[PDB]
Symmetry: C2
Subunit: 263 residues, 2 copies
């Protein structure tokens, strides 16, 4: 079913790296990582089901299990049976789910500002953001969204870009139904008792100034996982790969190479 | 006078006075983690802003920062305080600037904590979000969102029981829709960008790199525009950086007040 964006391999049989975005679901989230990653890997990006170019009306029972299954089956269908996963936030949860359900496929896993189970803090954030959704629709959602993603100074020095992104986010808004189904799936994901079984090498990347997910979630992940390394960026926010790609990209390239080689 | 002020005892005869001016929540208790260190060297004044806390009132439609300064200033003169330092947080920093403009013979030195010259588009965006919550969900939804704009995530996440108790206090003391909206209007309209020349007293600018509500670019703007300022940037602590990392904040504040009062001795 699901459309995937496969980059050209830089050389024969380059290892595959699948990039999994967070709640916005969009493959284009990873734009500032694509050039460096395509230099070494066959990169896969995609829009998650119910978002972007994979529109759908998501069902009531929609789960992270299903999200993993959808991506994994699309990959197998594209001829990809072994792959690395780099996941952002919700995308890290899908990555963990893939490492649990398809351990013969997932080579290594990178979690960017992910978590074992949703923190009270992140719930509080989503309670505020749901309130905006219900009272002010897509416009109010999009208005608040970057305040959870980017540092203030980063955003404030980039008004023309924020304006263009705010217009894009509203025009490509995934809709109330799918957002609420995906949020539900997000909140219910709980890997705290399954982290043992995630046996592939794992890199945990987080930013100290992430407003949406406290880095204590990454510390929790790191304590629970059998084979993980944790790197903390001092700044950059939840969307730390967007705001400081120079630091992020160096952690990602070294991390991927390290994890594939300890495997 | 009607406006209640909380005066600490002076530590010695004719100790310089330092007036602490809180941000939008208006509450003198905001400064609790600074009081012990400050009272050792200064006569400290704290207060609840009119329309908030223990100075309740229904604020009128034309309410402005000019009026806020007038209210605090008159209360100070009435308590026998004619020369005083101002430490202001956010909106409080704007009141402090206003006081430096309207009562230059009184304000000895000014410290701006995560203040600004005029409201940034980013801060407007933040307040627009928060206004939506106010209008759609009342005090409960306002208070629910509030700490997200004040504190780092990790600081908050490690302190759920404290946040819960502060949220209940904030709800029971909620300044009310009318006053909040009047004070926000006042806040947004304050514009010192053409008046910075007139702020002639020594100034310290303190900010936090991780302030979500006011980007530190505002403090950089203040620093470029003021005739006599120093700027210190804390690496972490958020908008409420005196609450979250008082050990760093207090050191900057105590050293700042001493440095500024020495500048003033040379400028006198």
């Amino acid at each position: 079913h699901m459309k995937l964006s496969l980059s050209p391999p830089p050389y024969a049989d380059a290892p595959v790296v699948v990039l999994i975005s967070g709640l916005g679901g969009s493959g284009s989230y990873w734009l500032p990582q694509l050039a460096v990653l395509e230099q070494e890997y066959q990169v896969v990006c995609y829009d998650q089901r119910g978002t972007g170019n994979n529109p759908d009306t998501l069902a009531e029972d929609y789960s992270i299990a299903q999200m993993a299954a959808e991506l994994h089956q699309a990959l197998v269908a594209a001829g990809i049976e072994h792959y690395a996963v780099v996941g952002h936030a919700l995308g890290a949860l899908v990555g963990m789910q893939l490492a649990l359900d398809y351990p013969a496929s997932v080579t290594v896993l990178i979690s960017v500002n992910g978590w074992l189970r949703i923190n009270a803090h992140t719930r509080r954030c989503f309670q505020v953001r749901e309130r905006l959704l219900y009272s002010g629709g897509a416009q109010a959602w999009v208005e608040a969204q970057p305040l959870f993603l980017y540092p203030a100074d980063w955003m404030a020095a980039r008004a023309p870009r924020l304006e263009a992104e705010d217009a894009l986010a509203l025009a490509h808004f995934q809709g109330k139904n799918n957002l609420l189904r995906r949020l539900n799936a997000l909140k219910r994901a709980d890997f705290s008792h399954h982290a043992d079984r995630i046996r592939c090498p794992v890199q945990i990347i987080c930013a100290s100034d992430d407003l949406l997910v406290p880095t204590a979630c990454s510390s929790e992940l790191h304590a629970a996982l059998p084979d993980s390394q944790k790197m903390v960026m001092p700044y950059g926010g939840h969307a730390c790969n967007v705001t400081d790609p120079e630091t992020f990209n160096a952690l990602l390239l070294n991390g991927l190479a390290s994890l594939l080689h300890h495997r």
